[PDB]
Amino acid sequence: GITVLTHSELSAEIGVTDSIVVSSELVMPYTVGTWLRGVAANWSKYSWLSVRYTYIPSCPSSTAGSIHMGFQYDMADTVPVSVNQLSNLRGYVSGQVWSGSAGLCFINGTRCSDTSTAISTTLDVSKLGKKWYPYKTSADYATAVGVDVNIATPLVPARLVIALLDGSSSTAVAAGRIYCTYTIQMIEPTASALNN
């Protein structure tokens, strides 16, 4: 009763400043993107066969700045505050805010060789707490972690932390965007209106 789906989609718009800015995003259907959010809601649970966040630039080669990404798995753990700490994470990747074009290969689904430069990273998937996670909505998840953060580990597999710095302006400069490419298995359908 598995419905397998492979798709790429926009995940976040990216900008750079001269001071470091750290952020994180949950790695669950509801938050990766608007498309998958609407689709996955029609199923009770899901499993990540593959999830990869890849950064694609949209700025001039003269643009100052660098982007950093990595994964965390215990939402209770505190979020990195420096490139140093972030570099220790699983799947850590780093690159110039104007580099990463080679990552298109993964999004397009096409097969390619020159990937060395790609600012793209993939999830363990096989090392996650469990295989089948329940589809959650921000609101519901929010309330849960509101009671206690640990209530989250059985609700979400991991979070992607991002850091942007080395920019030339104190005012964000659009650098590019992060796309999410995934192969998800969705099971146990439900009327979407009932899925919290």
In the window 126-165, what residues touch its own copies (CB under 8 A)?
Answer: 127-130, 132-136, 140, 143-144, 147-148, 150-151, 153-155
CA dihedral sign, ordered 140, 145, 151, 152 = positive
Q: Does 31 bind Ca ion (CB under 5 A)?
A: no
Check the annotation: does 148 bind a ligand.
no
Helix (H) / strand (E) containing 30: helix 29-32
In the complex, what is the shortest distance from the CB of residue 22 to its own copies, in angstroms, rounded to a whole number? 12
Vertex 4: Cα angle to 105 and 194 (nearest 5): 120
CA distance 18 to 16: 7
| 196 among annotated binding-site residues | yes
Tell the smallest beta-carbon distance from residue 2 to its own copies (Å): 8
74 counts as binding Ca ion under rule CB under 5 A: yes
| CA 152/CA 173 separation, integer angstroms | 34
Q: List binders of its own copies among 44-103 (CB under 8 A).
A: 44-45, 56-66, 71-74, 76-80, 83-85, 87-96, 98-99, 101-103
Query: Under the criterion CB under 8 A, does residue 171 sit at the interface with its own copies?
Result: no
The amino acid that residue 147 corresponds to is: V
Least distance in Å: CB of 92 to its own copies? Answer: 7
Alpha helices in 43-153 (DSSP H): 83-88, 104-108, 138-147
Residues that bind Ca ion (CB under 5 A): 74, 77, 134-135, 195
